[PDB]
Every structure is written in C-alpha cells, then in structure tokens.
Symmetry: C2
Amino acid sequence: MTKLILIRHGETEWNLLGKIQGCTDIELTPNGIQQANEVAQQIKGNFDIIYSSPLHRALITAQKIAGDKEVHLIEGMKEIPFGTWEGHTFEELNGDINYKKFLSGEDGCPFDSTGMSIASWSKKNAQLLLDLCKQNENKTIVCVSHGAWIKTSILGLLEMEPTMYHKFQLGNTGITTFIFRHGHPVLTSFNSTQHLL
Amino acid sequence: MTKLILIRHGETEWNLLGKIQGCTDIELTPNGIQQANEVAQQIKGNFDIIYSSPLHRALITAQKIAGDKEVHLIEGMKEIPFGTWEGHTFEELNGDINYKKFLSGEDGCPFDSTGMSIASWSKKNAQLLLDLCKQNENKTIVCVSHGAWIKTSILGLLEMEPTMYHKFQLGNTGITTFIFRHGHPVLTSFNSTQHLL
C-alpha cells in the first residue's frame, strides 16, 4: 500500500506570463500562497513522509502541506533545465529547430540546447521515483515538484512515449497519485484541482 | 474553450464485489447515491449540456448532477459488453484464453468473445466523443458513463496503446476532463475524487 503523491507547486508570476521558468528561483505570487494552503487542507496531513524541490516555489508549497513534518529536500526534484528557453514564452520559440523537435518527438523531444530531452528525463525521473518508493514501502509519499518534471515522471512511470507529454496539462497545485499493481505503477489520479476556488 | 468532462457512475453492489458489471442494470447503493450527490455538489451546475448512459446506475448519477437540466441519453454511452465475463471477478477469469490476451495485449486485448477489444473501443468511443464535441463547440460537456467505457475513451482520445488501459484506475464518480489544443484533446484531469467525504 505504497502511495505516491506528486504535487505541482503554487502559482508564480512567470507561470502567469507563460515564461518558461526552469532554474530561476521565482517566488509564489499571493494567489500561489493561497493555492498551497487550500491544497494543504485537502491533504490534512494524510501522508507519512514529504519530499520537495529546493526551489522556493516548491519548498514553500511543501512546507504548508507538511505542517509539522520535516520537508526533505531532494536536488534531483528540482525542475528540468531549459537552457536558452528560460524566460521565453512558447510563442517566442516558433522557428527554433530544437522546439520543432520538441513538439515532434524527433530526438526524444529535446529541451533547448541542454543535451537532454523528454525521453531522458522520463527514464531518469522515473528511476529516481521508484527507488524513493522502494525506500519507503507501504507508506504514503508526497513530492512537491514542477510541471515539466512531474509530467516526464508520469511518462517514465507508465512507459509512455515522449510525445504524450503534450497531452497532459498540469496546473498549479494539481495532485497526481500512483499505487502499485503488482510491481507496476498504476495511475489513480492526475491534476486534481477540486481544492481550488 | 471546448471542455469535455467524463464522470463514472456511483457505487453499486457489484462494484463492491469485483463483479464485472456491463449489461446488468444494477442500481446504486445508498453510498453510491451519496457519491452522486457529492459529485453534483462539486459540479454546482458548471456545465452546459450533460449526456448519459441509459443504464440506471449512470442516469441516476447524471440526474443529480443535471438538477433542472435535461439529461441526454446516448445509447453508445452504455458500458462495454463483457459477454461471458459478465457477472464474474477477475480471479474467476483466472485461466481464460481471452483474459490472458486482455492483459498481454494480444488481438488488441479482447473482452470475452464479444468480438471486440480495447483497441476497437478506443477508436469507436473517441470518434463518438469527438463528434459530440464538434457538435457542442465552445461549451462544457458532461458525460456520465462506465469504467471500461471511459478508460477506452481516454486511450482513444490520447491515442495510447491498448495495454495502457491497465495503468489507469478509475473510481466511482471519478472526474476526467479534456480540452483542445489546437484541435487535439489534452487531458487536464483524471479520476478526481476530492468530493468524496
């Protein structure tokens, strides 16, 4: 009865503008702080351990959810880097050879000029997540992270192809949960946002 | 701004028992009625049109959600037929040539010997849902249906491979939404169940 709970952080200013926010340590907006509270309430402490990205937008979200538990930082849960895309909107990326390969699945859907892609991040982030579940078997695990990172984890966990990435939309504070049957992750929910008013 | 919302019906006794429940017109349990009220309370009439399976369990659920709106009956929203499987638990299906295929992926994962597979229903149910959307553009559509039906609809809509069916788990009153970008369905929720108290 291992349960994995992945939670995208609250709203930032860059999120509102559509600016690709990777490694830039943007803070929550005031609405984003509220999203974190509302999602903390829904949880009502129903978990054993809670992990988080080191970026403040995640970490602050995690801390509200945790109440009185320690929030464990995992550096591997930081958001995926986007290189020369950082700061840009997707409209500003039209006619970038790498972005046409992102939409198209060519080359595993490369992220900018980082050397990495949806394909690699999926294996890589799925590997991390499993080991973290073996480490905490028969427990309910929460992980506060980011949109590109959580989406690739879903693709990695359920073995989907890189292009499926674009068929998911994961909003702020959206909950995504798995369980295991028998050794394989089973998606029991994705981007649940009913706690948002 | 076309939104498609797929909702599974409330609990029945056969659900409680793990009994495959297709053509049998089983009523809701009082819990399952409560479920229906809850999901209705969460939806608060935020939809334009609402469709339903004819089977009682769905209709009753849709009826509570619809309030004073008309529930529109679609014959093809009926649960997938399961043939011989009907009335059985998967355990009892331990050792059937077809059930092994249903897991293994052979012949597009057959259901009983109904002659149809997950493959076929993915295509068929998506085609219906796309058409129901093309006919309701820039409206929010709710559709009350069944577990297998909705799951194949997802595989169809997101063009996934039939074995993925087993990597999804849908609960009673589970909500599942789609939007379009540009004209391709994008999943924005799966199995949201926050309304259950």
